[PDB]
Amino acid sequence: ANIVGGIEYSINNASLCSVGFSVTRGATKGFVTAGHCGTVNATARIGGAVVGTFAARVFPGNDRAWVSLTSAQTLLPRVANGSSFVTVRGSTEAAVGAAVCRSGRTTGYQCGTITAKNVTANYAEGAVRGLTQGNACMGRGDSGGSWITSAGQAQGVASGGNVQSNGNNCGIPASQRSSLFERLQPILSQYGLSLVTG
Partner 1 sequence: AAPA
22 is catalytic: no
> Per CB under 8 A, does 34 bind partner 1?
yes
Residue 1 · residue 51 · CB < 8 Å: yes
Between 136 and 175, how does the x/- string for binding to partner 1 read (CB under 8 A)?
A: -------x---------------xxxxx------------
Residue 157 · residue 179 · CB < 8 Å: no
Catalytic hit among 10, 22, 36, 103: 36
Of the candidates 28, 55, 89, 123, which one interacts with partner 1 according to CB under 8 A? 123
142 is catalytic: no
Catalytic hit among 10, 143, 146, 179: 143
Comparing CA positions, the residue from 131, 120, 133 lying closest to residue 174 is: 133
Helical (H) or strand (E) element with 195:
strand 194-195
Candidate segments 22-30, 86-94, 99-107, 116-124, binder of partner 1 by CB under 8 A: 116-124
Of the two residues 52 and 144, which places its CB atom closer to partner 1 in the complex? 144
Candidate segments 21-29, 69-77, 106-114, 119-127, binder of partner 1 by CB under 8 A: 119-127
Instruction: In angstroms, give the least distance from the CB of 138 to partner 1.
Output: 11
d(CA 84, CA 101): 14
d(CA 51, CA 75): 12
**Gyration radius of the chain over CA positions:** 15
Catalytic hit among 63, 91, 103, 146: 63
Of the candidates 14, 27, 95, 124, which one interacts with partner 1 according to CB under 8 A? 124
Q: What sign does the CA torsion over 107, 198, 20, 12 have? A: positive
Q: How far is CA 59 from CA 34, 36, 118, 124, 125, in A?
A: 8, 6, 16, 12, 9
d(CA 177, CA 17): 20
Instruction: In angstroms, give the least distance from the CB of 1 to partner 1.
Output: 24
d(CA 146, CA 195): 12
Instruction: In angstroms, give the least distance from the CB of 160 to partner 1.
Output: 4
Of the two residues 32 and 196, which places its CB atom closer to partner 1 in the complex? 32
36 is catalytic: yes
Q: Which residues bind partner 1 (CB under 8 A)?
A: 34, 36, 63, 121-125, 143, 159-163, 178, 180
Q: Catalytic amino acids?
A: 36, 63, 143
